[PDB]
Paper text:
Glutaminase catalyzes the first step of glutamine metabolism, converting glutamine to glutamate, which enters the tricarboxylic acid cycle. In human, glutaminase is encoded by two different genes, [name] and GLS2.1 [name] can be alternatively spliced into kidney glutaminase A (KGA) and highly active glutaminase isoform C ([name])1. Glutaminase, especially the [name] isoform, is highly overexpressed in various cancers for the utilization of glutamine. [name] can be further activated by anions. It has been observed that [name] can form active filaments both in vitro and in vivo.
We resolved the structure of [name] filament at a resolution of 2.9 Å. [name] forms filaments with tetramers as the helical unit. The helical assembly interface is composed of four protomers. The secondary structures involved in the assembly interface are α-helices 351–365, 375–384, 407–419 and β-barrel 371–373. Sequence alignment shows that the amino acids involved in the helical interface, F355, F373, N375, F378, Q379, and Q416, are highly conserved in mammalian glutaminase. To investigate the functional significance of [name] filamentation and its relationship with Pi, we designed point mutations disrupting the filamentation interface of [name]. Negative-stain electron microscopy (EM) revealed that Q416A disrupted the filamentation of [name]. We then performed activity assays on Q416A. In the Apo state and the Pi bound state, the activities of Q416A are 0.26 times and 0.63 times of those of the wild-type [name], respectively. In the highly active filament, the helical interface is located on the catalytic core of [name], and the tetramers are compressed.
Author numbering:
A (entry chain D), B (entry chain B), C (entry chain C), D (entry chain A): 138 to 532
Write the structure that this text describes.
Amino acid sequence: SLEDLLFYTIAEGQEKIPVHKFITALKSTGLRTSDPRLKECMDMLRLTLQTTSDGVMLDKDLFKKCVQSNIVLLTQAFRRKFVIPDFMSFTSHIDELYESAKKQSGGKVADYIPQLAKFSPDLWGVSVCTVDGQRHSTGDTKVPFCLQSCVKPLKYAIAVNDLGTEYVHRYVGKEPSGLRFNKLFLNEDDKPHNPMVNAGAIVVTSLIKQGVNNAEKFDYVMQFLNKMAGNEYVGFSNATFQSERESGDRNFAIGYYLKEKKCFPEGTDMVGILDFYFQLCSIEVTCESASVMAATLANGGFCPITGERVLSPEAVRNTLSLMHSCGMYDFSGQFAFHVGLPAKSGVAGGILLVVPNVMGMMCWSPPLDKMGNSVKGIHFCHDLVSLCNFHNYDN
Amino acid sequence: SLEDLLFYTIAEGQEKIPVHKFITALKSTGLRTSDPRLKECMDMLRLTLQTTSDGVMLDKDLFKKCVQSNIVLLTQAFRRKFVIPDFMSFTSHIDELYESAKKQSGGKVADYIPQLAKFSPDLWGVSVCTVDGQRHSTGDTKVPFCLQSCVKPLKYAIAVNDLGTEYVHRYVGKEPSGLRFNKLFLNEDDKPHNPMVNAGAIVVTSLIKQGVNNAEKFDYVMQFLNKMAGNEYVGFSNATFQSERESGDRNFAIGYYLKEKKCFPEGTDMVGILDFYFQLCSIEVTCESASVMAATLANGGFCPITGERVLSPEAVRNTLSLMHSCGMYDFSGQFAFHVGLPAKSGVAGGILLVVPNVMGMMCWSPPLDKMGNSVKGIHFCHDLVSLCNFHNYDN
Amino acid sequence: SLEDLLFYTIAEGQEKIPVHKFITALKSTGLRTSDPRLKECMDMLRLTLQTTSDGVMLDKDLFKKCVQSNIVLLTQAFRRKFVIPDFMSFTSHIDELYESAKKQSGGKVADYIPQLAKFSPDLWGVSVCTVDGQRHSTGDTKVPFCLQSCVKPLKYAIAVNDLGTEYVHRYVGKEPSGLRFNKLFLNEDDKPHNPMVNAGAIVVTSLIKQGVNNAEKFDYVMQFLNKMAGNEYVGFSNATFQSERESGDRNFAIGYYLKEKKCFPEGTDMVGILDFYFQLCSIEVTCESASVMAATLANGGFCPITGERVLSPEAVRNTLSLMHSCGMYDFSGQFAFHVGLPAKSGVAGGILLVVPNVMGMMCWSPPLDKMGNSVKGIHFCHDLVSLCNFHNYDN
Amino acid sequence: SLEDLLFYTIAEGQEKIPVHKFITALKSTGLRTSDPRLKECMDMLRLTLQTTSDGVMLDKDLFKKCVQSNIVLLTQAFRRKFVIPDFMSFTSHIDELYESAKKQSGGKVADYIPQLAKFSPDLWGVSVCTVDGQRHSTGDTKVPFCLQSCVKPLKYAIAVNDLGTEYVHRYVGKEPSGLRFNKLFLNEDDKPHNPMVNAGAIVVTSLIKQGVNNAEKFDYVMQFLNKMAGNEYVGFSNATFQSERESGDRNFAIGYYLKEKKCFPEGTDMVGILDFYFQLCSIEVTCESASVMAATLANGGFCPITGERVLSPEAVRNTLSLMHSCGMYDFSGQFAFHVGLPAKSGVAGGILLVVPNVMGMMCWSPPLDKMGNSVKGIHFCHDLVSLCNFHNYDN
């Protein structure tokens, strides 16, 4: 049977296979023992460990009993039918790129609020989540940090998922602005140029769950992020929020400018919307959870490690299309010339990368360049395409 | 004696001069019986009327007794040594220009707040106050209306009077912006282009009576306006204030923009300053009092009908210099090409005109042209220069 | 004819009656030449003065022509059929009481805001407006001052006039509280004890012109006050308003208390209502206009000097009933024991008195007693009843 | 040697002791393998497991090497010299009391905000942290929930720790109020009766880290809580915060009342302080971390599982003294009559208990009784004293 073939493949001309050998073989592919899809499996393994004092042998029966539950994924995992047959080489390349970027230093940790100018200019982490569940991480990849501007794609997606592309873009433009993210001007039809600049993001935040109050708005967005991350860490930084809602004079200017030109739906409280905008900017993540969010965007709108649909196909398509042409603001043209991938960056360090149909990725380093991007993150993104051929127009 | 010469001049080969004849002769020149400088005089006249049942004759003694108090002004008034020897012809020209402008119609009363779109498109008033006390008025020249933007010169003057030109312009520019009054941009050194656009006016309002609260600020400004108007009507429109503080999204945007670029003194509440700005815009006047304010600006900084110094010579000079090049915003170049006078206008109707060393003038008409100026006011200003040769560069 | 009888009554065995004699005879009764009901009359008199150089005689024709317009009031005025046949004696008593109260001194001008602690402790004015137009004033009776708490009756009346007693008292109680005006507690059914304490007044202010914004609310109330005052001075003190909205911590506490116990109609902004409450407290009056307002309350809800209905009979009845039992707060029982009249008082000085079916009265003196009432006002009210028998239960 | 004696005690007439036997023996006492004080120890054990494929024997050398680091605690733990020699019986009693309280049902989950009326009326957890590190938990003891009112003691302690008892009580009273927690009245010297009612808590929150902004205030308090909890879970509920800052009309009333009676230090923003108060109420904990906080209070102000001093002895003494007489508000007298322990309760469920010199405890159950306390929590507290003799006045 297929289970017998798998057992023989794991074994080497022997009779019994220990549990630890099976676990190591599973983890070598790239899957994590904590994968939700494997939950039942591991549970049974624990039930097997509850009997023996130390170590247990699975010859025919217990292995089949444990592997019987949802026997689809394991066959592909051990038949090397994923999107990256050898993840242990791509992980080595990720490590080499990480080391190469670590030598690069010299920047300026953001200091417009005290919660950003408290990270040492040495934290540096990279996390990759493949579209088929393979995950790898290297560096400070569990220190919480605020998404800041990395949430703006995640916002826009959600709106189009709940309302639709037609209705949503009845409010925001679709074309690169050509100027800085915080510039106070609108497109030809007095609309934000796109939902990636601050004006369009402020507009988009007002199309989400209209009518209900900010508690319900925040709860709805948090639930969406939780199942988009695959039930990974999504939190809130109240100290960052309290600093940000006090130093947001430019965003207040933008909000009033938008309110004067009638850029909001009917029946919208603009100052409350702006507070809700700061709150969504103050959501904490780790490289692990943000990599899973990017993988969700890259895959189909389905979660990679739960197989759950979170966004419409149209939402993901619209999200990647706008990220490619507006993700780095007036640097996107030059970021697309050398990387050619959908990407977003926040002033707290952090590059969110989508390799569509391959993976999502998060690269966090607090120190910034003059453009507002982490130096190591930009270096890593530049080198990854030159060493792995991910540019969209490569052959 | 000089009093005897004046009495003979008033009389025509007779013995006694009745009081009414003297009053008519005085009013023919242009002075008003309610002139503060003549106060004592009129009081004595009343003391003379308290005795006789009807009519009284002044031959030698009573005339000298009444005229003795402050006998300087009367000699100049009856010797035709004022700045306009015959005011009864300039008044006729003012009436002709008023009639000519009345025939002109077709505009749009301001309707962005309900307190402006309640004046019939037929109110039309003109008031002139000469630098030497002569006053004339024609039309609806006692209906209250908000100064709105006509206060911005009066603001700036006051600041330079209390602080100084150097300190004041350490905060605002000195050059025409080239764009609209409410555009959200600053000069080369991130400063308002001038104190006539909304940004520079918002900055100037924060240099006045710093430290104290808005009650004391408002009281100080009101006192300054009261002695600048010569103790004429200066009031407040609370309904207009309540409407304006609710529809001021553009000014809120400008204020937050200025707060982000550090365009205020140290220790300034910007939202409180903005409320104080709306309040100063909500001060009511009549053509009579605003004409006296303009006469004060035109004269020396001294009041015309009280002989009291209200502003420094530097304040008046700086005020007229900035009004000429910025009074009509991006229309000033064309307003200075055909009128060549310091002028200011508000969306509530109302043109404040200074003819330096000659007079001040107020022309109120609610209906506006597309530029934002009263049609009849602009017509009157254009025709006054073409019929009286007031252009600064005329010969 | 009746006109001939009046002419003979004015004359004393003569042929012609001069205009000044007629004016003096009219003013001796108590009516003012500026009475709106007499407007046309005076106009014709001016038309008569435009011809003769000085003085004019009315024998038969011109007198009839001038008196023909609205010949009802004059017959009653000269037949001594008013409510006070000899007003020249009640005026003498008012003057004696004024002089008696002036000798009394020693108090404490309110100093919780700077706009109240700026009046010298010597201003002292009294104004009386009879239900039939007779008016008398003595002292500083044209200096503006804020009504403050004297508006609370005027508020409540208006609500019941527009909504009805049943609906209005569905929200506020009807019984004396027994405690201070600013105590933070409610009646048995979690309602304000009455609309004279601050809680009930805050509730009443929210029943007026619901739905519209504060500009329209303020305009509506101002119009109501203007025709209630008979087109006398009703203004706004922006400096007092700005001080009062900053030192109103007790009223903010009361408003939040009321908001938590659900003491407002549905769809009410409590902080906006509180601002509107401060604004209505910041309306300026003079003894002249407030006396006319009190006369309107006393008469029928009709204006005394315009013959215009301003409030429903139910509104006036309910207003006087609540003023009698709650006008002085926990002093009313003792104020009704010695005066027995509807009265209200404000911390800016000012006693508003109603003698129902007789007159209205305003007595202004800034210095306060420990209870919060002007010393001279309380003295005048005590002495007026002891010298003129106005107590409601007198025989 | 002492290590040899310990090894013999662990062993039973054998040569070698396996690691798992030692771990089980250690955990039987009550200590947790994750104890920070044992950190180094466990690390070495891992270094021992890295060599052998499965299982390892420690005869003389490795046991001494692992136990050498900080060999003080183990001797007391295995000599039964802790404060509870047999924790496995107190844990059994805790389980019996938990089961007894679970059978009790019938209450009303708080529903004044939606974040409280979302917990099923079946969550029920109890956690005990002994003063010497022993810990036990039963039930849903890791579900986050807001402290709400359980933070008020933790607040007050901190203030007295940083400023001092004399200074702190210069602002708040020291005596039971006799009325409800949210009553709007003050003591004889216009001061909050104590820092356990809402007024005194609002005052106390304004004495903490004065001058700095709410970001720094929140960070300081969070750090204090983190080392008071022993580096256990301390978080924030932004949704609860956003709901609570919108439904806090009573607390706004109390704050304005306190601001009017001058109950704050000089230079305090009361609305900002109130927001900071809501934020501190919105801190999430679990029964595990709150039990450790209570143990810190009970012990000496030293942490139980880190041996670190967090508060002054005066702070802990003052905290327990005020909790005993004010912890349950106007129920304390009856709570002290049957329990006689320092305790605090919040409307989110949750009883914080201190058994001074013995332990701290947290008992969470959302459904409330009419008094505002969790039914199962009150039942557990009543039964614990009747079955274990913890009442302060027992013999």
